Design a binder for this molecule. Structure first.
Ligand SMILES: NC(=O)C1CCNCC1
Ligand SMILES: NC(=O)C1CCNCC1
Lengths: 237, 300
């Protein structure tokens, strides 16, 4: 059934499961035409498919050529997502295929279920959690590879860098969702926090800075402050 | 005009014959139903006065044999039986008629309701849905489950309706996932009509039989089947024009006949609002939409 605060530790058991988020698949800019009407122009997108136990991220880049000649792009985007996730599963060795796929938006359930009819033992699940994966494009290196793509492409990342050498996957996921929640509520401030100290760098093979354990505690504290604040700035409290 | 005699009526019971019904008191001198129109299937059905639970009954066609009813005690239920001695049967019926111990099938001359509800229903197809090959008539009751219900448990007592499942490999062509799920024309026309039913008449016959079992016995799996068969047509962009016109007539007479007080349980709000207002065929069911909007506007 649906994934929620009650069954939260199930994300970190050794059974393979993937989150699928489709919020950045179909992206546009909305603009005025010379005639003064409104036109939208599609830009590159991505499917965000994440194994929360290991941090392995399967970033399928969605080139603008996919929408070339199509109608009802918002609906197509969901089926394109399900098509690509299904193709990913079929490409994995049997022992690497997920036993569950959790979709972050309920509208992905039927498209994914239909595309996965061949895999009746893979459970397709919704979630009640409000996960902040839409902010994946605020991660500079992820945004960069999506915008530079000239064709459809899959790029593999570990969204936890080397954190699992020192912390558990429960704690790593908690850090990740905090970072992304902050980036989503006030991207400029969040990014200021993460880079303010120029002596802490991002390794070429990493997505986030090389904080020590103590610096991560400070960083994490500063992100909580941001989120509560904005929650004040927003609601006035 | 044919006759279904009753040996006796030892228990108080409401007896239905097609869309009609009458009450019989415990040990009332009731000996059956005469003047039954030839050319149609019929259903004779029962609700005991003491246990309104388990409506049950028998689908039959008097062209296929001489049938009678007798309350056998073993099982506790009015049972249909065939009399093979045709002279014994004619003699029984004539005596009961002379003594005027039979109710007359009370058809109004102008009235085509039963025809309109059973237009495509054939006994030979009923007997493949309800498997009991040693009888010419078929037993149905409120509790019997469908083959598909059994997949989600006694196979002999099942309703073998054609399984329809919109999220199944039968319904969805590899490579056409989005197309086939959003437009079910392939599944309707190639899988179901060309492949399984062979023609639209057999499709409509099963649809009409499912509705009647839902209405007369409160059979929940039959109601599921009726709605699934409607939804498969309405969710197809490509349907033969004659099928849509006939469907509108079929559904009109079904909705017209449904008891006003059973609409809450026998009509699925989601299917009907989708079919009449969202689907490809939202504009193709004028008679059905008009009677639904005037008889059950709350459901919509
Ligand atoms: N959930 C997983 O991905 C497990 C982690 C441990 N290695 C096998 C795969
Ligand atoms: N296909 C495109 O890139 C645009 C997006 C939707 N509006 C016009 C066509």
């Amino acid at each position: 059934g649906a994934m929620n605060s009650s069954n939260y530790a199930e994300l970190f058991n050794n059974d393979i499961k993937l989150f699928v988020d489709d919020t950045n698949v179909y992206r546009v800019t909305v603009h005025k035409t010379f005639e003064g009407n409104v036109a939208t122009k599609a830009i590159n997108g991505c499917i965000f498919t994440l194994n929360p136990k290991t941090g392995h991220l399967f970033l399928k880049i969605i080139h603008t050529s996919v929408w070339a000649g199509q109608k009802r792009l918002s609906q197509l985007a969901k089926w394109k997502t399900a098509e690509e996730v299904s193709a990913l599963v079929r490409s994995l060795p049997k022992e690497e295929q997920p036993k569950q796929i959790i979709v972050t938006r309920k509208a992905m359930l039927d498209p994914l279920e239909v595309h996965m009819l061949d895999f009746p033992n893979i459970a397709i699940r919704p979630t009640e959690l409000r996960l902040p994966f839409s902010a994946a494009m605020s991660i500079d290196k992820l945004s960069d590879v999506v915008m530079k793509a000239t064709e459809p492409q899959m790029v593999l990342f570990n969204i936890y860098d080397d954190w699992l050498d020192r912390i558990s996957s429960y704690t790593a996921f908690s850090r990740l969702t905090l970072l992304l929640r902050a980036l989503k509520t006030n991207e400029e401030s969040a990014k200021m926090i993460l880079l303010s100290d120029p002596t802490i760098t991002i390794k070429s093979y990493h997505l986030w800075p090389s904080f020590t354990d103590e610096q991560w505690i400070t960083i994490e504290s500063q992100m909580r402050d941001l989120i509560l604040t904005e929650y004040g700035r927003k609601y006035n409290v | 005009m044919n006759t279904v005699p009753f040996t006796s009526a030892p228990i108080e019971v409401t007896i239905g014959i097609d869309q009609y019904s009458f009450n019989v008191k415990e040990n009332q001198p009731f000996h059956g139903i005469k003047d039954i129109p030839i050319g149609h299937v019929h259903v004779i059905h029962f609700q005991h006065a003491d246990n309104s639970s388990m409506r049950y009954g028998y689908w039959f066609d008097c062209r296929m044999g001489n049938f009678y009813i007798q309350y056998d005690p073993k099982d506790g239920l009015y049972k249909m039986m065939e009399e093979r001695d045709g002279a014994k049967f004619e003699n029984i019926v004539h005596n009961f008629k002379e003594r005027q111990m039979m109710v007359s099938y009370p058809k109004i001359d102008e009235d085509d309701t039963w025809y309109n509800l059973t237009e495509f229903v054939q006994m030979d197809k009923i007997r493949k849905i309800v498997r009991k090959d040693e009888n010419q008539f078929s037993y149905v009751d409120s509790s019997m489950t469908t083959v598909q219900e059994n997949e989600l448990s006694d196979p002999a007592h099942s309703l073998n309706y054609t399984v329809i499942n919109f999220k199944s490999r039968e319904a969805i062509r590899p490579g056409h996932e989005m197309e086939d799920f959003l437009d079910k024309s392939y599944y309707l026309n190639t899988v179901m009509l060309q492949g399984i039913f062979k023609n639209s008449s057999n499709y409509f016959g099963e649809l009409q039989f499912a509705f009647l079992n839902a209405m007369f016995f409160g059979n929940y799996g039959s109601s599921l089947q009726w709605h699934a068969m409607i939804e498969l047509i309405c969710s197809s962009a490509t349907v033969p024009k004659h099928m849509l016109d006939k469907l509108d007539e079929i559904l009109y007479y079904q909705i017209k006949t449904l008891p006003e007080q059973y609409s809450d349980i026998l009509l699925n709000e989601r299917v009907w609002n989708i079919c009449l207002y969202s689907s490809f065929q939202k504009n193709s069911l004028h008679n059905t939409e008009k009677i639904m909007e005037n008889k059950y506007p709350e459901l919509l």
